[PDB]
Amino acid sequence: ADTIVAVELDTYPNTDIGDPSYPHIGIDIKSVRSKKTAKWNMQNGKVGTAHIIYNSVDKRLSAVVSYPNADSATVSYDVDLDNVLPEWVRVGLSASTGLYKETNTILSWSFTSKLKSNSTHETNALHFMFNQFSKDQKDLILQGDATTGTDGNLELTRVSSNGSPQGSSVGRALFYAPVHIWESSAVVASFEATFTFLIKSPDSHPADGIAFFISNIDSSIPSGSTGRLLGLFPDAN
Numbered sequence: 001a002d003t004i005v006a007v008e009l010d011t012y013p014n015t016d017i018g019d020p021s022y023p024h025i026g027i028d029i030k031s032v033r034s035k036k037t038a039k040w041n042m043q044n045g046k047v048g049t050a051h052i053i054y055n056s057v058d059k060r061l062s063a064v065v066s067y068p069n070a071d072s073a074t075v076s077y078d079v080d081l082d083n084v085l086p087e088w089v090r091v092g093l094s095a096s097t098g099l100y101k102e103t104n105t106i107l108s109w110s111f112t113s114k115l116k117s118n119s120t121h122e123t124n125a126l127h128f129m130f131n132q133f134s135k136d137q138k139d140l141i142l143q144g145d146a147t148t149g150t151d152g153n154l155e156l157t158r159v160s161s162n163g164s165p166q167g168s169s170v171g172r173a174l175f176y177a178p179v180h181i182w183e184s185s186a187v188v189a190s191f192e193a194t195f196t197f198l199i200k201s202p203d204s205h206p207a208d209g210i211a212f213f214i215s216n217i218d219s220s221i222p223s224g225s226t227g228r229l230l231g232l233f234p235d236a237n
């Protein structure tokens with residue numbers, strides 16, 4: 001019942017649900033079966049950076065994911081998000097572990113949304129930036145196992161004191177304020193997101209991934225959306 005648009009950093013290849021046979025980045029429109037993917041040379045224990053951009057003129061959602069000293073991966077999909085998402089949405093980060101696992105640590109997260117009308121000098125805009133997350137983060141909605149304040153970080157999935165990730169975990173953080181991605185007099189609407197992330201696993205096979213998403217405002221973690229479903233989807237349709 002939730003409507004989900006997402007960019008996925010999928011760390012575990014579930015080839016039965018259309019994943020390529022490698023860690024990849026994907027654009028997901030209302031399904032975990034990415035409309036478009038690109039190989040991603042994920043680096044266990046390194047701080048990666050994800051960038052997501054879109055506008056209403058190009059109607060192209062794109063993402064680039066990089067680490068220091070490495071080539072980047074990029075993926076794009078032509079989609080009019082005004083025909084997918086409602087006029088008001090929330091934006092968030094989601095992550096999961098299954099029988100395979102990893103830390104899903106967010107060190108920073110920023111977002112900008114702009115609606116520009118045909119009115120002279122009439123931009124509407126939201127921008128937030130989190131470089132340091134705190135124990136009691138009132139401008140975030142945390143769902144599932146997501147916690148804030150450990151080392152100034154957002155831990156999307158469960159991690160023990162000692163610092164090792166737990167399997168079968170799922171968590172999300174959504175920005176408190178609803179975001180307006182369309183208005184009747186808009187001539188261009190754009191958003192961008194950036195997050196930095198540290199995926200570390202004691203295992204050779206980490207799972208399952210991190211996603212930036214945009215949903216209906218009332219979105220919650222669907223049942224059984226641990227593991228391959230990334231805390232985003234009720235199933236693999």
Ligand SMILES: N[C@@H](CCCC[NH3+])C(=O)O
Binds near residue numbers: 141142
């Ligand atoms: N209180 C919930 C969600 C509502 C946010 C209110 N500041 C949380 O733990 O994130």
Ligand SMILES: [Ca+2]
Binds near residue numbers: 011
């Ligand atoms: Ca997967």
Ligand SMILES: [Mn+2]
Binds near residue numbers: 008010019032034
């Ligand atoms: Mn995938």
